[PDB]
Write a protein that binds this DNA or RNA. Sequence first.
RNA 1: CGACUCUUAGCGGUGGAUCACUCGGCUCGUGCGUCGAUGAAGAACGCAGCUAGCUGCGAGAAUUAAUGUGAAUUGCAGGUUGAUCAUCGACACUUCGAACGCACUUGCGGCCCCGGGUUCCUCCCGGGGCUACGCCUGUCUGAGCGUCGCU
RNA 2: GAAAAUCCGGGGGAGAGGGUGUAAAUCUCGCGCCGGGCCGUACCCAUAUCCGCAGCAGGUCUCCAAGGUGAACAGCCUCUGG
RNA 3: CCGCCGCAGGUGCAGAUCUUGGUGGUAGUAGCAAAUAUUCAAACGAGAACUUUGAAGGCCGAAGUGGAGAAGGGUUCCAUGUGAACAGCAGUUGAACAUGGGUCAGUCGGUCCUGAGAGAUGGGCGAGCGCCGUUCCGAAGGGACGGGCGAUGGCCUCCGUUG
RNA 4: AAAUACCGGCACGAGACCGAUAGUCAACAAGUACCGUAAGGGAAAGUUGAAAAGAACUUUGAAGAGAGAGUUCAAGAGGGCG
RNA 5: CGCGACCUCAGAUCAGACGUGGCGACCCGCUGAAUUUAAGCAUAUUAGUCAGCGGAGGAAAAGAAACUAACCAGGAUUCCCUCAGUAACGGCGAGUGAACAGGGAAGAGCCCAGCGCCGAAUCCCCGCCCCGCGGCGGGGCGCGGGAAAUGUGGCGUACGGAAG
Lengths: 52, 86, 122, 50, 196
Amino acid sequence: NKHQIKQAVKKLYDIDVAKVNTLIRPDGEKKAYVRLAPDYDALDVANKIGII
Amino acid sequence: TKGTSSFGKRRNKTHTLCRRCGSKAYHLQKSTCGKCGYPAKRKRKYNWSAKAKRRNTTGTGRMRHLKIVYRRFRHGFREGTTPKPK
Amino acid sequence: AKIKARDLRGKKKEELLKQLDDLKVELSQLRVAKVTGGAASKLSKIRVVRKSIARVLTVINQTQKENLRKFYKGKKYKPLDLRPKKTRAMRRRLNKHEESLKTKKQQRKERLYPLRKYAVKA
Amino acid sequence: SSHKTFRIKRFLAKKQKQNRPIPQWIWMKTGNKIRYNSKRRHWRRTKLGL
Amino acid sequence: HRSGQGAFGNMCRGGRMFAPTKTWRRWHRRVNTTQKRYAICSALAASALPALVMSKGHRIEEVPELPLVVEDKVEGYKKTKEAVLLLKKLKAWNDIKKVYASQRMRAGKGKMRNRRRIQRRGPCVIYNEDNGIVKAFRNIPGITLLNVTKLNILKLAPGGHVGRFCIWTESAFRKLDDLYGTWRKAASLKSNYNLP
RNA sequence: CGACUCUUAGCGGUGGAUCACUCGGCUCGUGCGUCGAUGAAGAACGCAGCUAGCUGCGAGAAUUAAUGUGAAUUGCAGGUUGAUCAUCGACACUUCGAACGCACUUGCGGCCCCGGGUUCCUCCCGGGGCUACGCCUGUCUGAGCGUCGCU
RNA sequence: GAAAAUCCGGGGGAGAGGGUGUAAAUCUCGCGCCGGGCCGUACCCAUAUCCGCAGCAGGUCUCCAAGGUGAACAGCCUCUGG
RNA sequence: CCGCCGCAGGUGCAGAUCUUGGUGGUAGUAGCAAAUAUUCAAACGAGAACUUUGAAGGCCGAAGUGGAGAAGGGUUCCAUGUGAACAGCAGUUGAACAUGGGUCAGUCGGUCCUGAGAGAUGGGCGAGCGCCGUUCCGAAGGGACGGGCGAUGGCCUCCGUUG
RNA sequence: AAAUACCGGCACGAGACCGAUAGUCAACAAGUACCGUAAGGGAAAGUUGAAAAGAACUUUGAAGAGAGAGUUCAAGAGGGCG
RNA sequence: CGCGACCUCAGAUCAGACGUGGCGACCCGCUGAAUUUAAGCAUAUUAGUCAGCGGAGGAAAAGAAACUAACCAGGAUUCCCUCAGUAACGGCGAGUGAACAGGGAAGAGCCCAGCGCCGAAUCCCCGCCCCGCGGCGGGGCGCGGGAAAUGUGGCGUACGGAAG
């Protein structure tokens, strides 16, 4: 669900989510666009998970 | 206009993918699989096509249960015992 | 740390689930390392972690079902999981006791007229 | 079409991922026989059923 | 590629062969017992004359007597070292040394059908009892062991040619008068049998 | 002398015969003679660091454990208190399928119990267990101007 | 010259509210708080992404529709776009 | 691998409009002629009648050669790279090939409803897989208002949940 | 019960069988590729060498392709190659 | 009117079980053609065969005489040899076509209901305790429940049986 992704993104990355959009790719895997609440920078938590 | 011109109008399917046999034979209006007859409890197999039988029999697939039964047979179907430890 | 299924079994319930998440986070960080595009030394480790998750989850499940079939040992009704799964037709057979049952009339034949050990001269 | 069922989009997903050429280290294996992928499928030529 | 090719008929590629071979071909042949007997008799009498045994190709020049008959001690042999030593002394060994020379590869498809190595036939050692003689001789190539009571036409006369070299034992040789009889005394070990 | 054409030969092409190979068939024989609501056969979809097919496998996903074996695996990397193989008895085994809450869209519920937001409090969200048909023994519950009984 | 889901109005008046109030039940009024999962969504849509073995003069359901001439959505010429 | 003596057969090809595969002559031939049309300069590049940019001349002419969709396709979309094969000349180009990318909904749809109809159970038939039938020969309702006898949640206050 | 049957299944052993147009349709990624709306139809396709030692380096070409050199008993075996 | 029985028939996500579907070489039950043959053809033949449907098992089915015989008699079933291309069937055409005895492989016999006797002498299920088994079995304990006289168990079955 969007609901399961919201509680997953929260619990694994100690962040809170404004909204989740989802699409299922042509490849077949579900991509989630997890918009974050405005008291958290995405670019400052993207470095913490380790993506650059 | 019975050939080339009439093939253009072919744009709505009679069959779709059956969900027993996976084959594109599940007639949407009749709601029966032309291959396996899905809503019918028993498999649609006929003795007049020996070739059609042997395409879809016990050999064909994995036998993910039935292959280990053959392995479990040759020890008298033993249960709840382990081999003796180190 | 090389995780083997001998120094997991003796350990405690919540002690093993701690180690499970200690591996789960380790794996999720290696799947980020796979996509951020580097470290062949880390892409080999991803399999080692996948199997050590499987080792822990097995020993979790092994010790549950060693404890459940100890719990359900004395009882007359144990769950369908714990009952002996062999072939279906083999479960439908008469018990070790039921095949052994003789009628009173047949026990009397066996007593009066037992098949004798004999041997005839030519 | 644009309007799809989830069941068909999973079928079309698998068929895409099968339509990639063999890796160039598969033919360096000891008992290699495969030269190229024979089960490749172009969208003009072979129409994937349905 | 098959669509519209040619599928039935001897001549068609793929296709069925003309008159497919059945398993109810008459494979086996029965011979009259009297005729089977009068083949063993003939196969035995040919072995007596060195003219016919040499013409079968058996190196028997050094051999002391053609109906070579050895002691009943030979039955009690257990090691091949004992068996090989005996043939050196009887001077039947150049017949085995000739088999060794003949050990070549079979020409044709027989190689891929479990008939790869071919060689020659050696002497045929006939024994009454078995106190180990079969164990002691079997590793030596060319030697076939026969019981006297159970003599085979496929082994005494190999190829259908007559006069194989035979090495009798003493106890074997004396049973032939009983098995086959003389012309005045019928066989005691056959229900109703005279010599032809 | 031309060029062209034809014949023969050498050499070179085209083509894949012939021969020699055979981890495949075919045939006969032997021993066994074992599927499934404890979810079969079959199907779908997934699973490898690099991986399409085949094979293996099931979210523990080219495998876990256990035993036997005792140093490999290998296309390229990479990191003996047991590598790898074999065996296989422990454990696990996604979706559909007899296919089982109802529908085939993966669409709608109902019940009971858990946790979180909450401070059981009706919503919400997640998770868990149940909810198919026939039928048997029993159990419970009521039905009948069926047959009576008693007040 | 459709059905049904769905929604509303009315006729009735079983009930319900509290003893002059810190009013009560009750409000289809105005605000405020919380939530809305699952699946499809790219592109072609045709003198080259569909069907006719093909970039096949065939076939394949629609929507929008400028100026001039003119009865005109005719034909002919032109602008946007191609 | 073969000679000799025997044994055995799926044992001898020019044909069957034979079967399968290969190759000729035809022949560098028919052909690459439906819907008016191209031209100049430059750029990249080993290479340009065809690519790209600019300029000219044209065409579709709003019932379009325009802009969007439904069926159907299934990644053909998009960028970059390549020029083997394919795109019946070519190609620096492509819907080819190789890489990477790309489809974000409470409100657009689907889901919901019923239509023609399809189709279980009851029943009926049928040797049987089953078929007929859709309100018909059926004990086809598991749902709300009140109320006692009871129970717990809150200072059991009194209601939620319920027996 | 036994003696009896058994072209499916799990194992095996064997052959006066077939030898890649043969033998199973299938010796190989074969009930695969591909065809049909569907029931169904259904291929072709074995071989470098003892060992990849699979041709470095130079040279012409934009390149495919060459010329040399080199490996090898042999390329008169150069990756669909006895 | 009420309450207690009984009978007959409903409902349960009631406690515990069980069936379905697959494979289908062999096997059991049905159903069942036409090519073909007869130089045509219709009865016959193909053939109770192919296809169709159902049900199994490691084998199945059969099976301990409502038998064969006509003998000096044999003695369940199944299988092999032979009877035998026979007796018989048949547009008496084409064609079809067994059995007994005989030799062998194997060899094994039995049980009810009824009839009657024994105080239902019988069986099932729940709860406790003790063994105890991945074939829920054994022994205690209970005015614990139930089925069963519309007949459970023992004795007994044509070879006769029972009672004293």
